[PDB]
Amino acid sequence: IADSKAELTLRNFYFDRDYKKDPYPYTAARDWAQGLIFKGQSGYTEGTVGFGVDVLAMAGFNLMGSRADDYARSGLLPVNTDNSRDDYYGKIGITGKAKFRKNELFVGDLVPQLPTIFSSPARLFPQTYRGIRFVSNEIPNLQLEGFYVDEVRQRDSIRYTDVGTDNINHRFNKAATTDSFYTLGGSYQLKDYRLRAYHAELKDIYQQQFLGFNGKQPLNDQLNFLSDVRFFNSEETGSKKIGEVDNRHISGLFGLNYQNHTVSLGYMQSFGSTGLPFLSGTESPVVLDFMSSDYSNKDEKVYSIRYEYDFKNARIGDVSLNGLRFMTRYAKGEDIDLLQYGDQRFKEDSLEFDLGYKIPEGKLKGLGMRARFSHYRNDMPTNMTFHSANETRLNVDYTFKF
Numbered sequence: 451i452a453d454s455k456a457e458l459t460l461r462n463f464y465f466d467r468d469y470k471k472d473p474y475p476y477t478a479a480r481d482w483a484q485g486l487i488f489k490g491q492s493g494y495t496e497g498t499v500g501f502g503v504d505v506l507a508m509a510g511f512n513l514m515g516s517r518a519d520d521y522a523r524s525g526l527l528p529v530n531t532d533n534s535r536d537d538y539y540g541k542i543g544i545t546g547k548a549k550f551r552k553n554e555l556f557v558g559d560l561v562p563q564l565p566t567i568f569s570s571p572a573r574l575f576p577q578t579y580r581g582i583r584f585v586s587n588e589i590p591n592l593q594l595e596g597f598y599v600d601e602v603r604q605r606d607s608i609r610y611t612d613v614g615t616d617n618i619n620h621r622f623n624k625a626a627t628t629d630s631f632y633t634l635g636g637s638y639q640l641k642d643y644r645l646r647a648y649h650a651e652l653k654d655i656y657q658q659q660f661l662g663f664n665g666k667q668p669l670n671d672q673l674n675f676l677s678d679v680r681f682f683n684s685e686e687t688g689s690k691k692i693g694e695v696d697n698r699h700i701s702g703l704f705g706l707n708y709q710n711h712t713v714s715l716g717y718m719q720s721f722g723s724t725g726l727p728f729l730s731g732t733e734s735p736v737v738l739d740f741m742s743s744d745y746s747n748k749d750e751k752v753y754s755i756r757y758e759y760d761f762k763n764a765r766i767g768d769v770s771l772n773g774l775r776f777m778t779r780y781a782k783g784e785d786i787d788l789l790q791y792g793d794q795r796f797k798e799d800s801l802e803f804d805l806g807y808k809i810p811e812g813k814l815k816g817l818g819m820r821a822r823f824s825h826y827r828n829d830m831p832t833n834m835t836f837h838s839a840n841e842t843r844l845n846v847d848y849t850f851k852f
């Protein structure tokens with residue numbers, strides 16, 4: 451007990467991606483949902499080997515009634531083959547764990563957080579996987595980790611299904627599934643920088659390596675230089691169920707932080723015969739994580755700029771603004787090759803705004819609210835995955851810690 455941990459989160463999420471050109475038959479992807487999530491992580495039994503258990507429990511509700519059925523699926527709620535939402539969905543993940551010195555083994559339901567396998571947090575509930583995770587912290591400053599998983603339960607699903615890939619913008623021959631995925635590597639923490647390397651195989655689909663670093667380095671007493679750089683290398687393997695895969699992808703975001711301001715510039719580029727592959731049900735793993743597209747197409751070059759302010763030291767009269775944060779960012783992607791268009795190339799851009807407030811003290815401490823807006827355009831054909839849209843996400847969350 452004594453080192454157990456538990457939290458209960460209540461979430462209200464409205465999602466509206468309002469398509470500019472109403473690609474028949476939908477005017478928007480939209481849903482309004484509420485969710486409860488319980489996350490419990492026990493400590494370990496005493497013994498040379500210690501044992502414990504972790505649990506994740508999720509209950510979600512539709513707040514739009516049958517009205518929801520006239521819109522394209524958001525991902526907040528399960529949607530049936532006639533487009534009707536399920537009005538309620540519930541699901542439980544359990545994990546058994548064992549520890550020997552600073553080595554831990556986890557078997558069951560998992561929420562991976564690696565560049566080769568990163569559970570999507572971007573809808574109501576987390577994506578989860580079923581398998582085995584091993585983590586060693588025996589080496590100071592280095593965390594070694596691996597996953598072997600064979601099923602995935604998507605954020606908007608109550609069922610485990612086979613691991614695999616989605617087909618974004620017809621990037622590959624098809625979306626495919628398979629029976630296993632494994633990844634292993636490590637993360638090394640320096641004073642001001644973290645360095646990471648991982649290898650992954652999605653059986654008969656692709657192999658992928660990652661190298662990356664991120665840091666926050668003081669240039670003097672008041673100015674910090676922030677960096678996050680990610681490199682992927684991907685190739686097809688085995689029976690090559692999605693066909694050729696041939697990609698290198700580099701992305702970086704570089705920022706200056708001064709007196710609670712941050713200004714950053716971002717760059718991405720894809721190289722190779724294809725775009726970037728990654729697991730189904732989740733966002734691209736590259737540095738720029740925008741609302742309305744993955745920005746990860748074959749040959750796409752991406753330029754971005756970002757501004758943020760943390761209002762920790764700001765006030766409006768007697769009202770402290772601590773717990774307010776503002777961000778805005780713009781990205782443009784060009785030289786997009788959709789493969790089936792000869793020498794034609796495509797382009798896309800996004801202007802986003804993000805305002806979040808978390809109550810810092812008092813009775814309502816822990817209550818958070820966020821509003822995000824994206825104006826997204828592209829000149830891509832109508833059979834592609836992402837369409838010009840004005841996208842709004844509104845969140846109100848409250849977490850109780852036990």
Ligand SMILES: CCCCCCCCOCCOCCOCCOCCO
Pocket residue numbers: 709710711759763776805
């Ligand atoms: C209720 C206010 C919501 C405001 C949202 C828009 C914010 C645009 O924000 C940037 C705000 O920061 C301006 C303050 O300038 C201070 C000067 O430099 C040092 C301050 O730490």
Ligand SMILES: CCCCCCCCOCCOCCOCCOCCO
Pocket residue numbers: 763764765766778
């Ligand atoms: C839409 C334009 C891009 C963002 C520009 C922001 C430029 C500065 O705007 C400041 C607006 O005010 C925010 C409210 O600030 C309250 C207190 O800040 C106190 C700083 O000590």
Ligand SMILES: [Ca+2]
Pocket residue numbers: 468469470471472477478
């Ligand atoms: Ca519309």
Ligand SMILES: [Ca+2]
Pocket residue numbers: 528529530536
């Ligand atoms: Ca159903």
Ligand SMILES: [Ca+2]
Pocket residue numbers: 515516534535536537
């Ligand atoms: Ca319904």
Ligand SMILES: [Ca+2]
Pocket residue numbers: 685686694695696
């Ligand atoms: Ca090849």
